[PDB]
Amino acid sequence: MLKIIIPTTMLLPMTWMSKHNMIWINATVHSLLISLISLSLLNQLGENSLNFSLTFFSDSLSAPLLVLTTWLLPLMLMASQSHLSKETTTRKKLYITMLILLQLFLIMTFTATELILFYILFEATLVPTLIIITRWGNQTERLNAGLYFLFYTLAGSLPLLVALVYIQNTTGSLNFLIIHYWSHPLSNSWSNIFMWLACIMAFMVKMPLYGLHLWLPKAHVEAPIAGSMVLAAVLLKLGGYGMMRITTILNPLTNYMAYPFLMLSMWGMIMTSSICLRQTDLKSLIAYSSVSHMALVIVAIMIQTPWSFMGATALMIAHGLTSSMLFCLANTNYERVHSRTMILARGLQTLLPLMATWWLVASLTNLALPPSINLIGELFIITASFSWSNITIILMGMNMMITALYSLYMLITTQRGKYTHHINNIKPSFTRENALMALHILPLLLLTLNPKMILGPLY
Amino acid sequence: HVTKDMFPGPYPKTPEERAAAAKKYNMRVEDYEPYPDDGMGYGDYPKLPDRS
């Protein structure tokens, strides 16, 4: 695994020893090459895992997340090139350093054979994101947003640490392989109930769970474009990955303890999809859509059936790509209009036709149009839920209908109708933005050809 | 270019601040009517007719 970690570390001295006007080119080229190298982790086994060493191991759940993490950095650099133009070389190098450190921590987090090492890196990712949000955000609310994004996380994560060390004091190890092979049932006890809660709540808060989702709209709205991209694409999936790893020690207590979270997610997906219908801000609408999709992923993980896990993996990958694309489109509009109010700039199809095509395809993938991987994950989760209980179909279908409604509402409001007359600074789309949009969308339509790459270890 | 005094505020109680709120929203004092002072966060915002 060092053949990916070491180049990502070398990205830092290369960035800091670069010319003042070569940082973006060098960073983009070498991050793309690192993505290409990481692409060879996809050759997974039907047996246990790719156990590289005592410290790092790869799995067909970890490999798609690793590849998406490596692929996201070049897109983040391309998106950040525009709004950082008027800023000094040292500060741009610091921004690229924060992005590189975030990638390094995420890469080490997804392999992380140890649960304490996983926790340490899973919490180390917090610092670069907070600095990016509270340093290079625009509005005055960013500081407040950062505070939320901080404390919520720690409010969930501090009990987990205690639980973790407690387990190693009883089991003797926190290695995931030993934990899986030596797993034992949890008796229905108050102590075991609180151990279950301490294990679950940390990952629940970062999905986020419906009741615990307040930090996400603030953090995603006030963050710069690279921050929003990394928050929606990779950082939300840490909770799902952690739950998928940790639910192996929580059986059979998950059967009883899953009910409040299942109800919260099943009702909150409807609530947040309905919230999307009445939203005056593009970024907030995209954030609430992310909350709905992650609610579906929470349901899938809580059901803990093979089809549930496959659907959850597919949906995590598809949502990451789609939400990053949607945020990039919103930012392309914002850098022209500087308002971030959906109703202000209207009828952009007549002025930006190719960008309108990008908007249409992004809305189509968000709408879960078959045979996209978005719908593959959606349908697998829905079928698993139907087997779990036939009444889930009402909530699932209502969520599908509202999702289509708000996706097409977002498309029609911004692209169709009549152009706003007083806005005359809508310049033609740059090659950088179109390239960014294509680099988001072609991986999705190309992954629909080989779904088993993103269906997880239970395929 | 909007200042702090041009943003929505709390529910107006006295006719003087009622007139100030009406002047803020570019409409007549006789026509200005805020939402009823309930627990909802309507605050100082005109209750225009519900016509589409």
Binding site: Y419, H421, N424 | -
Partner: protein, 178 residues
């Protein structure tokens, strides 16, 4: 559409608007032209019998019973001209309307085609640049103190002046740009 609206509609304007609406809806009811002509002459006669009423209270009690009767028998599916706000081709060609400023973003290779058009466009832009400075002063001196009372604009007064705020009325895209 073009004309600025007033503060209110006078009684005569209300009566004339009711006359036009009732005639159009009767045409919707009376499909054939001879039947429509007969009933429209009857309708005009029924308007004319109270043309000379001097009592304003009487005339206002009238037109009210009349509009109530209209709302009762108003043909819930009246004929609409296709381009009218309720027609089947109302805003059909708005997607083809492109603003004129977009031409400023054209590539030089695009402007290499159509050189005469862009030369005339440059002339128009220069005319706008000078006329605007004249227009601001003329509007400032002609507006009454305390702000305008009606959104009606004055014409040009001198020889070389242009009507104030003319650019976006003169440079409309077209009724059917494509």
């Amino acid at each position: 559409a073009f004309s600025a609206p007033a503060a209110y509609l006078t009684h005569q304007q209300k009566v004339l608007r009711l006359y036009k609406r009732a005639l159009r809806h009767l045409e919707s009811w009376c499909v054939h032209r001879d039947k429509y002509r007969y009933f429209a002459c009857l309708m005009r006669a029924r308007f004319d019998e109270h043309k000379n009423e001097k009592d304003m209270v009487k005339a206002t009690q009238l037109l009210r019973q009349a509009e109530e009767e209209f709302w009762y028998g108003q043909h819930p599916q009246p004929y609409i001209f296709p381009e009218s706000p309720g027609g089947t081709s109302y805003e059909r060609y708005e997607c083809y309307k492109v603003p004129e400023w977009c031409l400023d973003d054209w590539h030089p290779s695009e402007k290499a085609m159509y050189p005469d058009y862009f030369a005339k466009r440059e002339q128009w832009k220069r005319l706008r640049r000078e006329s605007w400075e004249r227009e601001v002063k003329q509007l400032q001196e002609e507006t009454p103190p305390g702000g305008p009372r009606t959104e009606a604009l004055p014409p040009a007064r001198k020889e070389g002046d242009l009507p104030p705020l003319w650019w976006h009325i003169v440079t409309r895209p077209r009724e059917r740009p494509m």
